[PDB]
Amino acid sequence: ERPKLILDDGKRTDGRKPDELRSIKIELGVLKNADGSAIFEMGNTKAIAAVYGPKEMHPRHLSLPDRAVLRVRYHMTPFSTDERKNPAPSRREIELSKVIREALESAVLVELFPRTAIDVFTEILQADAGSRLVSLMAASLALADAGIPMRDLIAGVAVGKADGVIILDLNETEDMWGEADMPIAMMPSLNQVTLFQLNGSMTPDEFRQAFDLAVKGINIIYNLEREALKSKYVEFKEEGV
Amino acid sequence: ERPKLILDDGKRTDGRKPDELRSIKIELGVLKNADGSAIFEMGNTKAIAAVYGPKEMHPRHLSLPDRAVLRVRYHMTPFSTDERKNPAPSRREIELSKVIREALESAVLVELFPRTAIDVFTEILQADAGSRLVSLMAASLALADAGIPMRDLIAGVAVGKADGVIILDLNETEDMWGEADMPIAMMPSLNQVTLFQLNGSMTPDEFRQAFDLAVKGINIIYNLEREALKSKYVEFKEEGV
Amino acid sequence: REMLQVERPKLILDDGKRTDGRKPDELRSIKIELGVLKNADGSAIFEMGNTKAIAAVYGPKEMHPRHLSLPDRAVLRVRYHMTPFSTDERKNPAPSRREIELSKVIREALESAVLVELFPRTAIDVFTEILQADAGSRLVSLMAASLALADAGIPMRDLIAGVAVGKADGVIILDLNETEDMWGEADMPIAMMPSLNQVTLFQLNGSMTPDEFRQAFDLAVKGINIIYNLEREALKSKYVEFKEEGV
Amino acid sequence: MSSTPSNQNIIPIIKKESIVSLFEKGIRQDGRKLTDYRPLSITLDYAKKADGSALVKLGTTMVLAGTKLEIDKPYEDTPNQGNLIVNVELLPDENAIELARVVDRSLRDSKALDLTKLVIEPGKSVWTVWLDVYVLDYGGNVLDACTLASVAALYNTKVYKVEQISVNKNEVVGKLPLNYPVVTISVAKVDKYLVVDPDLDEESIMDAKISFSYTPDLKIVGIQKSGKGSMSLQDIDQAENTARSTAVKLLEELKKHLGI
Amino acid sequence: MSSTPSNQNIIPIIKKESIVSLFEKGIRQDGRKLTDYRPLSITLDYAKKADGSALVKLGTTMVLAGTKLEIDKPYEDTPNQGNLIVNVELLPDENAIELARVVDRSLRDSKALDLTKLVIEPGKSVWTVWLDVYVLDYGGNVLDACTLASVAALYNTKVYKVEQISVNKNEVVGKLPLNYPVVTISVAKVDKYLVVDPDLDEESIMDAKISFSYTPDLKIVGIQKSGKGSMSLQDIDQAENTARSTAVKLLEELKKHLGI
Amino acid sequence: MSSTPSNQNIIPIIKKESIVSLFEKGIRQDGRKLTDYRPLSITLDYAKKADGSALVKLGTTMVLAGTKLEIDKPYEDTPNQGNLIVNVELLPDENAIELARVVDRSLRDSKALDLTKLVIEPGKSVWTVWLDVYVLDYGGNVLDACTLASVAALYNTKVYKVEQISVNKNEVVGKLPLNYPVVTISVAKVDKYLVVDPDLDEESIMDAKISFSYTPDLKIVGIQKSGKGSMSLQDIDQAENTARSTAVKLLEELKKHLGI
Ligand SMILES: [Cl-]
Ligand SMILES: [Cl-]
Ligand SMILES: [Cl-]
């Protein structure tokens, strides 16, 4: 009835070990009419991000005297999931927009552009769990593509707990049926956590173990981001931490 | 199958005579972060009102050159009634918001604060009829608590007709099943009517009689309001006009 | 198999005549009156057969939130709306996707005629209400608007006149019924500034060969030219009645 | 959120005094007395695709009301009643809602329209009467015109044959179960004067207005105070006196338009 | 309410004359002729969790269309038809609505997709085809790319097995009942010139544009004029001529992408 | 669209340094320690017409939570579960949504409330628990007060007799199927210091805060980072340590208020 997540063999439903990331694909400057853009893929999670660069703000009373305003949109296309998602923003979509915005606000040097708006639009084209992170990373990279000054790049992974077993980078299968789902995002060079959420249940110990595993995953992703910055295109087949 | 609303000792469903107010409880300065606040109780009708004092207005084109704009919100909490009210503003809530705003506009000396907004938020915590008035009085008192200059305090009661009998300060039972429901509010010292509505049916004579009875009720309430202003707290057990 | 005659009705009948007794080249009756609303800057009622529209213009005025205004032009604010009792089954008052599109289409049509440059930082409000729908309402609305603008004395390149031309039973027809819209192969609303030969609105839903398209197009012009003269006359006399007749 | 209208047309003291000066002589700009109504036109069946309709011209105010009848399952709480839904639109909201509700209240509480006679199959199917009222021209005292338009539209309403499940819209069975017409009379307080049926200029200078709704045997059936100002006890006393003796004339005129 | 967009980026006369000067020599900024289309890319099944999908690159314009199929009770106003619901999103509304409806109309009126073949259990259950079209990059002439994306997505759409009540999403039964592809061709009026498939700069300087939808046999299946300006009779005449001979080339290319 | 709040009450560097200087001595403006909670009041059954309710005063923050129970057909994608719907209102949205969802998550994932015990007729009828949470006074750390108000409101909730189809609201059958209370502890990062239960001033100067939700057996049941700034790995490590030993005290105090 309800899927088994660790097979006798110690592997997960997609054949991965607990310490293995999904395949990663990143490309930059994919939209001609944006100031910066990026497509990010973790396994079957695809996100596209467009940045419309620092610009004077439409209604001025909504602008800030010392900073740029970040405007962030997290959105899922109706055909990103198995059942068709309603295009109207969900409570989930509204929360994640905020969570992602705050995450970016901690990285982007907004003080540099007073009275301006920076627009960041995210679209999940395929959801397979961890979309909030893939979105955030695509955003982070699209900002870098726009040449917007930031403290560091942002890298993230959802760490979790499957059958008592702490696992790295979740499936929708693992998300839906697991005991825990803990998306974590950092500015890896600064060891600064940018996004941090847990839904589900963990003992402090498990929390600490999972946290360590996220860091190793994040560090691998980070190097890929760095490389994507130079070559504009990066493919990474799945492998162990 | 309706209820008999007057028993043959001359008393109402709650044991009151036709000329008796419900118990009244008033307290001021109950919210620390508001500029003025008040809780008002008539029987089982509870309202809380917060005033956010005279302040420059967010979008300036919406401000007035010679006056303050009053912004009033009449709202019922979902758990104020027997069946759960939808938090989304109802046509009733929209109309009462306007009626209450106009009432307050006749009292508050808005000319004194050009280009500013005065915010008045009302919440009904328990509805037992007459909530629009309890809301208005709470508002009136919260304004006084904020030290906002006004012509007079506002005191009100719903006067009505039960079983051909003119009664003072209605139950939900009486509101639901009565022939008439006439909320009236004044600035008692000025003998100026601030809110005036009738739903139901009355002969001009009955109208005039009910009008007289409201005044006596209003005058009693008014003294309590005055006292609440000095002592910040007033309790009044039910009694005859 | 052999008893199953079709389901759609014939639209071209005895003689060469249509369901309402018109020939293919005949307009519906037209009624126009101006200055019908006292509190508007300009107003007009327009009627084509059983299609009635009222239009109010609230003349050039400084715009509420200024950031929404334009430095060199007036902003046109146009509302196309159908009253709930304009059709057979009650229409929901909430704006439909159709109502939103037609609002835009009509606005653009007016933008091409109105000399907006003359009034920078101002808004011109144009409210349209369909009181009875019998097809061609988008055009009746646009014309009523055009005329309400003239009633307000707002300078324009030309007046706007329009008609829906279409295809019934392989036959090209002028100025459609509810019935003809509902069962025809084609429905092609066309609107012009006739003196300038400038097309202001142009749409086709349905299907036509290029030849049929060109023929229908010619017929619309003749109809438009007749309607135009009536508009012109409505401008002088404030009231015009025109019984149905051939192009 | 309800806020003081920022568009509000502020009318100079000099012009106000002009108008007051006239009231002191007991006359208005248009030349009528303090207790007079504006000229009244009613055109019935103006909106042809409506079940019943009325175009009301009261001074420069125009209102077109139209009815539409549909078969609905009744509400589980009101099992033996048809439905009335009133809706108002201003074209030149909140005021629109107030108007709709005030009109509604006066039609419902008076029982002018008897909802219990709109039942077809009890608990199964009832008539819903959609009343849609469109203010086309804002000339002041819109409420009174809305009531007139509404009442007229209801009286103009044709009811159709019921295939029992289906409606047959070319056999007119009868009319709405109406007991009587109702009128609303608005009295405006301007300075120390009371004025019936205030026009646009009068409404902009008034302290407040108060509207009374009456049935033909002169029972009060709704009251609604309106406006940002206040009014004295005796003002309201006199206002209702004035409103009532005005109601008689207006009801008569209304009946003439309706064919009684 | 529909109002003149205040965001427009008004494009200086000097730059406009630059472009016109090129038109006079019968060439454009990107180097194509007045009647040429931009380069066209189509990637099928781009969105994996969609039933069918297509990524369309037309010049710098990008559109991703995706279909999703669901079982619904048919609408009681169309008992023997499945449903098509088209939806457009601009990411960089009203224009979105226009686009959705124009695309819809051209698919529906043409009978390119046959809705009557989407019936499962007549009156009981039908297929609803949700078509969601996402404009990812606004490079001008969005409508034409939307039509191409929509047609391609439909042709890419897999239909699943129906457990009769339930859908089985790992047995692909067939494809959509499609009769033929359709193309929309947009022709822009700029100065005295007609230009096919206008780019971003061209769209900002145009008087107006007109879009024609064609079936493979070359029947006109929709027309929509667009823009703040007007167009002469003969402009429209020539535009459709031009549009039509372009349609042939575009249909051929579309078919190559679809595998005919 | 989510955008940086323009109303933000930017608090001068001078005042911030003032507060930091105090933290350096391990004390705050109100005089509590870095790890202390503000004074806690809980008044049960404050909202009489609610099925269960609670008024929470935590420092100057006030939250009134109230429950309402209703019979519903269960959701198709959850046939053997009752429903919990949490809703938050700020009165002095987006933050409101976040709060609602965070609270929801901690109640739901913990199985503090057991939804499967809210089934009446399986597949036919279940209890829906509407939890409405009103922030009356914004004094900082609203989330922790919301959890406390929600938990207390659920524990105060009376369940009524079920006439089997109908509810009888004057026979109290029992209480909600609650397993245990839950608390959320917020830890704010200010400069290089960690502070429990930040007040209004503290929240405006913090880099970020992180909220941990615990069950009585000290299992972590939800985590939410909040704020415009970032936080180090070790900050979070220490924060949870601190949060946990705080949780014990807070749970004890909560139980005293609830009558365990
Ligand atoms: Cl996710
Ligand atoms: Cl009330
Ligand atoms: Cl039409």
Curated annotation (Swiss-Prot), chains A, B:
NCBIfam families: ECX1 (TIGR02065). It comes from the Archaea. GO terms for biological process: gene expression; rRNA catabolic process. It is an enzyme of class 3 (hydrolase). Belongs to the RNase PH family. Rrp41 subfamily. InterPro entries: ExoRNase_PH_dom1, ExoRNase_PH_dom2, ExoRNase_PH_dom2_sf, PNPase/RNase_PH_dom_sf, Ribosomal_Su5_D2-typ_SF, RNase_PH, Rrp41. SUPFAM superfamilies: Ribonuclease PH domain 2-like (SSF55666), Ribosomal protein S5 domain 2-like (SSF54211). Changing R91E: Abolishes exoribonuclease activity. The keyword Nuclease applies. Catalytic component of the exosome, which is a complex involved in RNA degradation. Has 3'->5' exoribonuclease activity. Can also synthesize heteromeric RNA-tails. Binds RNA. Its EC number is 3.1.13.-. The gene is rrp41. Keywords: Cytoplasm, Exonuclease, Exosome, Hydrolase, Nuclease. One of its GO terms (cellular component) is cytoplasmic exosome (RNase complex). Component of the archaeal exosome complex. Forms a hexameric ring-like arrangement composed of 3 Rrp41-Rrp42 heterodimers. The hexameric ring associates with a trimer of Rrp4 and/or Csl4 subunits. GO terms for molecular function: 3'-5'-RNA exonuclease activity; RNA binding. It is found in: Cytoplasm. This is Exosome complex component Rrp41. HAMAP family: Exosome_Rrp41 (MF_00591). The keyword Nuclease applies.
Curated annotation (Swiss-Prot), chains D, E, F:
Non-catalytic component of the exosome, which is a complex involved in RNA degradation. Contributes to the structuring of the Rrp41 active site. This is Exosome complex component Rrp42. GO terms for biological process: rRNA catabolic process. One of its GO terms (molecular function) is mRNA 3'-UTR AU-rich region binding. NCBIfam families: PRK04282.1-1. It comes from the Archaea. Keywords: Cytoplasm, Exosome. InterPro entries: ExoRNase_PH_dom1, ExoRNase_PH_dom2, ExoRNase_PH_dom2_sf, Exosome_comp_Rrp42_subfam, PNPase/RNase_PH_dom_sf, Ribosomal_Su5_D2-typ_SF, Rrp42_archaea. The lineage of its organism: Archaea, Thermoproteota, Thermoprotei, Sulfolobales, Sulfolobaceae. It comes from Saccharolobus solfataricus (strain ATCC 35092 / DSM 1617 / JCM 11322 / P2) (Sulfolobus solfataricus). Belongs to the RNase PH family. Rrp42 subfamily.
